[PDB]
């Protein structure tokens, strides 16, 4: 099988709180190289924070996290970990697992998809989902995903079968402190009444998962 790094464990956490991220490696043995965590705060750049050499457990950290975060690796589970303690607003970021290619290769050739860590004292809230209904040779229709926290939400259409013309908008933070987004799709007005359209909203922070039928 193929080289691959899958992060997990992210989510909402209160200031001063703790959290532990995992990074499952596949298609190579993490013993052969270094594993890193690199993070990216919203709208900012890439910041290396820790590295580990699994075989002997050697670790180094960026000053910004030194004394609060700990990296480790379970060779038998081929998995790396980031124990984050005493968390602060500034640690809010997408956390990526990456690696060094190996002995002669200090570039980072594989990264995971990243896991979002949101440090905040606000509590979890599932979205309400309302339809954005079409009427009047092209139609537009959508779903309003409203009043949820924290980020993120996934939206697909017709169980992933409809992706052409789809736009899912970046969330905006309302003055109430809850996020709201819309997801729209343009289709041919002939299909209206024949083919039905449903959006699959998913908010794993609240284990909310809702389908909604959009029609006039």
């Amino acid at each position: 099988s193929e080289v691959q790094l899958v992060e997990s464990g992210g989510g909402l956490v209160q200031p001063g709180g703790s959290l532990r991220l995992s990074c499952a490696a596949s298609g190579f043995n993490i013993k052969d190289t270094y594993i890193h965590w690199v993070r990216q705060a919203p709208g900012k750049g890439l910041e290396w924070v820790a590295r580990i050499y699994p075989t002997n457990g050697y670790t180094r950290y960026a000053d910004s996290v030194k004394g609060r975060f700990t990296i480790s690796a379970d060779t038998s589970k081929n998995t790396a970990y980031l124990q984050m303690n005493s968390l602060r607003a500034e640690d809010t970021a997408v956390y990526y697992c990456s690696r060094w290619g190996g002995d002669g290769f200090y570039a980072m050739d594989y990264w995971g998809q990243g896991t979002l860590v949101t440090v905040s004292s606000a509590s979890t809230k599932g979205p309400s989902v309302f339809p954005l209904a079409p009427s009047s040779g092209t139609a537009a229709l959508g779903c309003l995903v409203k009043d949820y926290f924290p980020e993120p939400v996934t939206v697909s259409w017709n169980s992933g079968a409809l992706t052409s013309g789809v736009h899912t908008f970046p969330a905006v933070l309302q003055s109430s402190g809850l996020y709201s987004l819309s997801s729209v799709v343009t289709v041919p007005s002939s299909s209206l009444g024949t083919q039905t359209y449903i959006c699959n909203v998913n908010h794993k922070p609240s284990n909310t998962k809702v389908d909604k039928k959009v029609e006039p």
């Binding site: 209904a133 409203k146 736009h167 819309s182 729209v184």
Partner: protein, 217 residues
Amino acid sequence: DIQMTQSPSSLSASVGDRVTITCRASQDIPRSISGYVAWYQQKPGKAPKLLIYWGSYLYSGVPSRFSGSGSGTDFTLTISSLQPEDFATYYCQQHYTTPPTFGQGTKVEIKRTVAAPSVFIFPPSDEQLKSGTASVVCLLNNFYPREAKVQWKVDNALQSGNSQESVTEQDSKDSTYSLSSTLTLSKADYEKHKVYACEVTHQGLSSPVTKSFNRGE
């Protein structure tokens, strides 16, 4: 602690153009030294991807239009023929020593022909009004360039402070943007006004376009 300082910060270029991005190390390194910088491409909401390693070596699977070079303190990424897929933020990195450090990033946007937005308006759902709030939504679909102004008008009364906009990242196939504007009103307020309008201005429109609806049809 080697800092990498990247330039320019943002740029706009057309399909087919040669694009050149620059990166400089803070530590004085001589011309006789090279091959310690790598370059990464990050699309919105995705992991960065390796393009170039050791200054100038092309990573497997990466299109031949990307190339790098450099020595001493100065390095360069070149895209020989910019493609619409190439919308992304580009980051350089030193792997001379630890800690690994990155440039600030260079945002590449694709310049293309002007396209006016297609505009659509959506009244609030019934299912929503029960909750005691009403959202009206205006969609500006697939347009270029990004600058566009949306004004709400309620029975001609121009609105302010009760709406928020969101705009998508440049599309990787057609290089357009889309935009949503959402007008949030209380039910009591929404009930006591009749015609709800959305007025869009954009350099591709000879005259502003207005989509509207009357409450209840």
